[PDB]
Amino acid sequence: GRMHSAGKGISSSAIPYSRNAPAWFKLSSESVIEQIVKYARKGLTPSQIGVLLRDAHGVTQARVITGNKIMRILKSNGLAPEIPEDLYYLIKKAVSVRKHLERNRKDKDAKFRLILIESRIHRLARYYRTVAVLPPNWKYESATASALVN
Amino acid sequence: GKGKPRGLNSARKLRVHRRNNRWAENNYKKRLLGTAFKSSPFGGSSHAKGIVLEKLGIESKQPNSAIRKCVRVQLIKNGKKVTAFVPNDGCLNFVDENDEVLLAGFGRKGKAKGDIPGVRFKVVKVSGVSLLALWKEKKEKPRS
Amino acid sequence: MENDKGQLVELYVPRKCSATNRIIKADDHASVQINVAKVDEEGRAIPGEYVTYALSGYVRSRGESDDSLNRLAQNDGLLKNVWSYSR
Amino acid sequence: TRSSVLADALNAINNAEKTGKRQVLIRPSSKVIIKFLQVMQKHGYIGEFEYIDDHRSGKIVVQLNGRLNKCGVISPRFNVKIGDIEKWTANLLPARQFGYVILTTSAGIMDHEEARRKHVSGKILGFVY
Amino acid sequence: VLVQDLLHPTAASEARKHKLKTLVQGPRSYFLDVKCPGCLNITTVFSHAQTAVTCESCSTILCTPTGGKAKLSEGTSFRRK
Amino acid sequence: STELTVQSERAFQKQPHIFNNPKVKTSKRTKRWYKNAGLGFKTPKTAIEGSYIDKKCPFTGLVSIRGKILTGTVVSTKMHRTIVIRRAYLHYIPKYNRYEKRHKNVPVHVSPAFRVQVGDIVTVGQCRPISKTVRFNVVKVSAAXXXXXXXXXXX
RNA sequence: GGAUAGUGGCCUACCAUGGUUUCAACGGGUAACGGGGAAUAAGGGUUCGAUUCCGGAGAGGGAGCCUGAGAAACGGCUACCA
RNA sequence: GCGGUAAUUCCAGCUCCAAUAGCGUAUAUUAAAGUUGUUGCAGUUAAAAAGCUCGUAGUUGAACUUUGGGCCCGGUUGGCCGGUCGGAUUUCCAACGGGGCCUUUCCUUCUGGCUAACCUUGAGUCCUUGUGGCUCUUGGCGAACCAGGACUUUUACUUUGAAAAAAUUAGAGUGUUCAAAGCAGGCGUAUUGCUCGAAUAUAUUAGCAUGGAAUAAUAGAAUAGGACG
RNA sequence: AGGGGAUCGAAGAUGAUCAGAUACCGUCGUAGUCUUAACCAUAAACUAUGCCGACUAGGGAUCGGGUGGUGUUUUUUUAAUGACCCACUCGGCACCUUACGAGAAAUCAAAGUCUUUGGGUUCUGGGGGGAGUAUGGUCGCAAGGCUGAAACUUAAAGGAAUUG
Ligand SMILES: [Zn+2]
Known part of the structure; x- marks a missing residue:
């Protein structure tokens, strides 16, 4: 699949049938x-x-x-930690990107990538919040995002 | 799957999308919008009767070349005015101006018949007697 | 394809490819029949005695009739090694 | 994303039949697929299949003969009200005398005929001839 | 082709294909004990570093990562499993 | 709903006829009346322990649970002693042989014997008309608070 | 509380701010009374149903009411409009 | 599409054709029509992919959790015989389902009201060398559903059933002389009655009742604020 | 709305040409072309071909990543690096050949697995003209964008291929 690009690559980790072992361990x-x-x-x-x-x-x-x-x-x-790992790094990136844009608003591409990253963020958090681990109110906003990391 | 949602629960989408697409069916659009009652010189009725205003002679469409005798009629039900052909040979003889002819369609629903331009109606019963019984020789034209 | 009180009805019970079991019918002039001589001890090859195979048109066109020969006519006995079911 | 695996497996069996092969690597595997294939070999349109066990969802290897024209899946598993099985078999089955409609009832994943005897019904899976 | 053994595929060409495309998938990554004569103690290492692995008590080096497998630090030796 | 005050209306809040005499020295103060709606709906502890009045309370009031007995999801708790629940369902259309999503919001009276919030799947029983849009009364809170405490903080 | 034969914002007094909504509210249209039904025959459908059976509404328009078990009646009255 | 001088369409004669106490016509509707396409359309060039990506509603959405073996019970076809005065049933016997089983295996659960059911047996036997057979009270099966206390994750789906005016409809019987109909009618002792009927079916969504437990949702114990005692 | 204004160049002015030549051709050259701040939102914005998933056939390239070699070539002393070679495998932009298959055909690894008709889902179309017109609504400074009928008329319009 791959959401925010139609890049259909396959690059994972093939897990062994050995759910036990290493035996040499x-x-x-x-x-x-x-x-x-x-x-x-x-x-x-x-x-x-x-x-x-x-x-x-x-x-x-x-x-x-x-x-x-x-x-x-x-x-x-x-x-x-406060929030799960993936949501953390997504948000973090979004924040650095945002700073990049507030350093030059002439970069349309940047705004695109920010829209995307943020959409990803919101979907993710919607999941986490569905499963009780993100408080039923928890939401992402920039003005608390640049604070959220620190 | 060519669009159409195949899910077991998308019934709403399918009937709605139906209605939607159905509006591009001329006879259905016509049947719902009104038309037959809005437009159309009759009341949507099978026939309608009016007064002959003037006796016309219409030059016929190509590649045919003759003159088609008709009458201009003002319907008694609604005062609309309609130019309608008089069928058979002669029969523009039987009419005269200022009468009371009974008109019907040309079996086309609107749509001019043959090489008769803009004429979508015909005479079926002038002055009370049938135009047929007049063109054969059965009946004869009433009083005056 | 029998009828009421038993009894055979409906003519013609068509051939059949040995390789695919796909029915073989008239207009398929692409099908084939391969006669293998059932030879005897030291040299001679008995006529009036054939291992007869049938290979339908599809396969012949695909070009699998060779591989289907190494397949069939070897585990039917008349070839050794040559083809391995594992690939 | 993979919408209905049963559909995929059946398409794989079918493309196998057509292409001329005898062996079908189908993936992934599930109870529904198993039961389907199980009522498929029971009437013998296929040989025998081997569930190979990757520790994930599974694999199957179906050895087929070639008696099968085409098997299929009625993806919207419509509900069948005992009178409607007749209608479905009437739909996609080449003749009355053979071929079978297979469906999921509360009595199990069974063909239309066993479904008829057992006097049970439910949703529909697909068909074999 | 037209007929083959899906259950029993020749190891010769089961090892050409992808780690996920095999009969039952699995990794192509091995673990190896790695030794440098600076010390009398060896060190377990994974073949595709990412992390530039350091040795036992001698903070020297062992491997610096790459596009795939880790380049080893020249004057060393290694043994699988 | 209610909470506190109980006596908080221009007219005295008393259950009809349930008389207790001031001459008669008492430790219970006010004698209380209750029942059970039937249909195996256990008259809740808080209905007999309660201090409210609600004459529309199925367990400690003057109405009767009869007719249809329904269940649904709570979408609204705002109006005093009355809530709005949403029963969803699927409607079968033959022409396309498919069921389409539909719903209905039934207004239902909720006695101060319950602690209803939005979400608590609930079971109500039809009664008489008690209002313009009320014909049911909450008679069993099946859910709870939908694992609400589960979403907390740290340590 | 009042009113009803009686439930009820049915009405009043106080109080609160609630109620329906793209799972289409609300509004417009209808040459729309609803149903039993009818026409067309692979199936799925489509179209129709003022009209002999049931249920509703009206008696030129509207309102009002007498009598009475039952009517907001009209081959009842009363008033207004036509 | 025919007619502008040899008109197989016009006006007529003659002949002829189809339909027939009826036939034309106009309007509408259904079929035709897979030109509304759930079944079942089409969209590169004929009608028709939004310039592009995000994305809420909607539709949809990987796999995995009682699988397998053994024992009984009785119902229905159907097969060689007939044991007979068209049809009867044992068993020889396969086929096809259903009920309860025991396999680490809630069926809500106590408290008795019902016990029909047997590991029971009490003397044995009418009688095939006897486990073929059941009348027969005393240690001895809970579900077979009762009445009362006490509690229960929610569904879609399907099954059988109840509740279901008649006319209509599908359809059984009856020769209105036939037919459309009607629900009549048919019999002797036709001078003092005899008698069969007036069926069955559909009645699809929703409500009720019930059998199922696959398919597909749902809820559960992770800050254990869990489970039983 | 500033800046900038080389270049070429709608408008316009001209010299030609032709019967006419408001063009084609030549000369002049306004706006434009560059830019920053804001608009506008349309292109044959085209592969005239929605997106995710599975399956179905052989081939030589080549881009990117990796793997495998007592392979070449680079010498410093054998290497290490670096390019090249061969093999293999992913994910590419592509072609080649074939047809199981598909289509009205041209053609198509999909435009295939489709009357033996159901993986999931979004969109659009229903003879031609009237017409992207009228009317309302919304957007825009404007030009205009989106949404979008009907009356009426019409036996064809159109697609692909063949011979002329
Ligand atoms: Zn070291």
Whole structure:
């Protein structure tokens, strides 16, 4: 599909049939979960942390060695942020873009991309709000967006 | 799927879109808008009767070349005025001006018949007696 | 295609391609019939004895009749290796 | 996005039949597809199919013979009021003597005939001949 | 063609295609233990970095990422699984 | 609705005839009358515990639940002791053999024995005309508040 | 509370600010009384129904009311307009 | 489309054709018409893709959660026989469904009112070497629905049924001499009655009642403010 | 509404030409063309072909990313980098050949899987002319944009292909 472009690419992660294993893996859930929460105190996103734990560390996927997903670990140990990760980075981008436009209003393309990013934001938040995790009132506005990050 | 919403619940969209598209059907548009009652020289009625105003002789459309005898009639029901052909051979003889002829359509719904331009009606019953019984020899023209 | 009290009715029970089981009818002059001689021990090839195959017009045009021969006439016995069902 | 998988699978079986192949890689798989194919082989328009298990939605491999002209899906799964099965079979079935309309009743995903005997009805899935 | 084995595809050409297009999809990424003689202790590394991985106790280097697999830091060695 | 005051009208609010005597020393102050509407609608605790008056209250008033018994979603709670609920449904059109979305907003009296908000799927029972547009009375709040506390904050 | 045979903004007094709406409100149109029905025959439809059966409305227009079980009647009265 | 001097269309004679106590005509309507297209149209060039993207309403929307095995019960066709004085039923026997089962398996739930149902049996047997057979009270099945307390995630769908004026309609019987109709009529002992009828069906949306549990929605325990006791 | 105004150049003025030549051609040259601030919202704005999804056929290129090589070429000492080669696979802008298939045809990897007629959804069309006209509404400074009839008239209009 791909919404705000008709670019029909395929570029994901093929998950193994091995919902268990790695079999070549020692350690325990203990070690790697401490790794998760400690890196979380270090201030990293579940995606960031997942990539880190996937490279330098020996964690193919942190959902199998530990029966719980990273963001859920963070929630479990009280490390979850104000808003979910994706909504955060969408909004953040939107804010930088907006600043770019308020630096030169002659860029029509920029206004386009801002419209798009914001539409994406609103759809997303409408979902999150449907599922109780965004407060039933929660809405995006620029004049609180540039504040929302900080 | 060529547009048309196939969902099990889009009934409204389909009937609405129907109505919508149906308005481009001439006979339906006509039947609803009024026309037959608005426009049209008769009342939408099958026939209508009026007075002969003047005896006309219409030059016929191409590639035909003759003169088609008719009458201008002012309908008694509504005073509208309509030029209507007199069928058969002669029969412009049977009429005279200032009479009371009964007119009908030309089996075309509006639409001029043959090579008779702008004439969408015909004589069917002059002065009370039938034009047919007059053209054969059955009946004869009333009083005066 | 029988009738009431049993009994065969309706003439002509058409051929059939060995490769696709697609019915073979009259105007399909693209169909084919392949006679394979049922040979005997050391050399000789018995006439009046054929492994007879039928390959409908479609397949012949697609150009799969060769591959359908390596398919059929090999696991029918008369070829070894040559074609592998795994690809 | 994929609207109705059953439709896709049936189109795949059909294009398979036409193209001359005997094996159908269909994807993804579901209970509805399974039951459909199951009432398809039960009257023998296909050989046997193999559910291969990717840990996601599934895969199926249908070995078909070629007795099948065309199978299909009535996507708007209209409701059928016991009198209307006759009408549907009348619609898309080549003759009375064969071919079967297959539909979903509260008694299961069954062909029109079993549906007739069991005296049950419901929505409609598609057809096979 | 016209007939083949979908259930049993030759490994020779099951390994040419895409990671999602195989019979049952899976990754083409391997994990490898990586060693530098500076230390007596090896380090587990994923083949497509993104993150420029650092070593054991010696903050030296191991790999800097690329368009795909991670370039290794020259004077090192590595073993799969 | 009501809340507080109870006696908050130019005329005294008393249930008819339900007399209690000042000579008779009491710990209950006012003797109370109640019933059950029937149809297995358990007369709610707050109706007997209550202090209100509502003569249109099905459990502690002078109306009767009979006829149709319906259910619907609450779209409006503004008018005092009365709400507006939206019953949706599908209408079968044969020509296209498809069901089309439709709805109706029934005005229904709600006793101060309930705590209704917008959303609470609710069950009401027909009665007499009590108003210009009222013919039903809320007789079971099936829902709750739709997991409203679930949307909170942090720690 | 009043009024009704009786429910009810039916009406009045106070009070509140509510009620319908693109799932089409409200408004316009109708050469529209509604239904049983009718015409056209693959099916799906289409068109029609003033009219012998049921239900409604009127007795030139409007309102008012007497009598009475029952009428806002009209082969009842009263007033106004034509 | 015929007529401007050999008119197969006009005016007539003659002959002839179709329809026939009837035939023309005008208007409208339906069929034709897959030219309104849910079934079932069409949209590159013939009518017709909005210059483009966003996007609310609307329509639509991946897959996954009781799958599989064994035992009984009785109803209906249909098959060789007939046990007979056109039709009867056992069993030999496949076919086709339905009811309850036990497989880790709420059926709302207590409290008895009903127990028909059997692991029951109490003496055995009319009687085929007996598990073929059921009259027969005493330890002993809850649902079979009662009456009363106590609580229940909401639906679409389909099933059977109740409720459903007649005329109409589809349609059974009856020879108004026939037919359209009508609901009559038919019988001896036609000098003192005998008698069959006046059926069935449709009655589609919505309300009620009920059987289903697939398809498709819905609600649930994550700041556990969970589940039972 | 300022700036800017080289260039070329609607208007206009001219020299030609033709019977006429308000043109075609030449000379002059206003506006315009550039620009900033605001309008306008139309183009054969065209691939005259809605978007998402599945399936259906072989080929040589080439763009972008990756993979695989005791491959070439670059030498510094063997490399490392960098271009080139071959293979393979994604997502492209394209072509080539074929037709299972499709169409009235021209033609079409869709314009295919479609009377053996149902994946999802948006839009438009219903003989020609009248006519994008009239009327109302809204938008615009304006020119004009959107929305958009009817009376009447008409047997054709039109598409693709063939021979002349
Ligand atoms: Zn190191």
